């Protein structure tokens, strides 16, 4: 007779940028592009349908960590845009724009592009009674951080208070984090660290930030949408071609009702299956 095989056991090996806008985050994570690492501020205000994370991704700005990291990174991957809108906060007496050589931006000191590291001004650090309202028609994602110094002397030298605090409030949200002082091992030098937390705002609601020290301020917000975007970890090269679904092993033909190459897919694809072969008689 003849036969139909139904399990797509073969991929193209390359990711095809049509019909999906494929954004290759070459040397960074989605978070690095989200935070504003200087070597990936090239991804500023980028939009996508599938972000591709490569294995050699890396970070060069201040050593940090994200509690609930996978939730954050895929929260931005689902809106599919890094559209950042500066909001011009007023930081009275606390010296914005702190940077260091771990994050060398340009000739010297730099910091996260979308983050505002505050210090003391003069020799003080007052408690910040800030406010910023979201009165528009869309939800705001605020990315903010805290500094975990490396010694009690570091805490005093920059945030004169013996113990600092940050409190990012809404009418629905409240998060109060305290910096635990400790000298971590060296990562890109420094023994101090930064931990990243985020605060979504929905329309009408207000975001207020109370802090006696260690605050890593935000500069603005990312406009958030609802769409078909996502992210992918892959080392498959990108070519200009056509395929409607993509796997970490490169694109797939959507010819066959089933597929064997990978469980991870994007778009209208066949359903992942364990089979190695399935021939239907014709």
């Amino acid at each position, epitope marked *: 007779t003849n036969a139909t095989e139904l399990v797509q056991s073969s991929s193209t090996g390359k990711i095809c940028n049509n019909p999906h806008r494929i954004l290759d985050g070459i*040397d960074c994570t989605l978070i690095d592009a989200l935070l504003g690492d200087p070597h990936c501020d090239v991804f500023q205000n980028e939009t996508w349908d599938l972000f591709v994370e490569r294995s*050699k991704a*890396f*970070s*060069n700005c201040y050593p*940090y*960590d*994200v509690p609930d*990291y996978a939730s954050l990174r895929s929260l931005v991957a689902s809106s599919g845009t890094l559209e950042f809108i500066t909001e011009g906060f007023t930081w009275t007496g606390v010296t914005q724009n702190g940077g260091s*050589n*771990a994050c*060398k931006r340009g000739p010297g000191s730099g910091f996260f592009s979308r983050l505002n590291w505050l210090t003391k001004s003069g020799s003080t650090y007052p408690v910040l009674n800030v406010t910023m309202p979201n009165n528009d028609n869309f939800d705001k994602l605020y990315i903010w951080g805290i500094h975990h110094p*490396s010694t009690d002397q570091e805490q005093t030298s920059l945030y004169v208070q013996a113990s600092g605090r940050v409190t990012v409030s809404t009418r629905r949200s409240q998060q109060t984090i305290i910096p635990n002082i*400790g*000298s*971590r*091992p*060296w*990562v*890109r*030098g*420094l*023994s101090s660290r930064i931990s990243i937390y985020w605060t979504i705002v929905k329309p009408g609601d207000v975001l207020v930030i109370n802090s006696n020290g260690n605050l890593i301020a935000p500069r603005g917000y990312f406009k958030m949408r609802t769409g078909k975007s996502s992210i992918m970890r892959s080392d498959a090269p990108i070519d200009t071609c056509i395929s409607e679904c993509i796997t970490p092993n490169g694109s797939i033909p959507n010819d066959k009702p089933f597929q064997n190459v990978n469980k991870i897919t994007y778009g209208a694809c066949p359903k992942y299956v364990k089979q190695n072969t399935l021939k239907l008689a014709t």
Partner: antibody
Amino acid sequence: DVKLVESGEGLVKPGGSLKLSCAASGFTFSGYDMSWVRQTPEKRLEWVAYISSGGDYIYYADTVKGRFTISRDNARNTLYLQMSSLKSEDTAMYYCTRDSDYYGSRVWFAYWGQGTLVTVSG
Amino acid sequence: QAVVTQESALTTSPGETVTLTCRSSTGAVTTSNYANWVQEKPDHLFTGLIGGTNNRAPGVPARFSGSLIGDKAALTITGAQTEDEAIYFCALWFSNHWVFGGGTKLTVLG
């Protein structure tokens, strides 16, 4: 597929000196951070030096301070350690280490070189 | 001070559960010491296995586990294999220093 390959093993007299190189391959830098660690003939492990992208923030084995210097060649992707005024106590096989990965891993000393032998002789 | 210590040698069987340990001389071992475990297979083939108190390196199978049992650091191999016959050193972070233990020789039978 990361690999670190060393060179420069050779015999030296006391107070003498040696320079060592470890050719790094398979990854984007010469190293994200890199460090030198030696194991004595008594098979004890002592960390020697450490580097940033450009050597930020304490990297000193106080027993080798003033005697060694660690360098990296960002262009040719090479790591260097030149030790001078050598002592008996420095006779070891020095290992080329690149400290481990991102937030998820952050394991120090995952990737190592196969080591090259330094003998402070007489 | 800063002298890190561990058992000289251990011996076990495949399928069994092992637990190598690492102690401080500065007192109690905390997460703030960031216990790091590197495995040397012979002819100087080192591999970092566990760092960051429990954090497992990418290629390391889940059978290896690091923990704190009491005031000690520890490395447990639940489901030991002949693959695990090696020498396992340990390193703890004292803020100024950065030190290794003598290393434990693991002798798997079978």
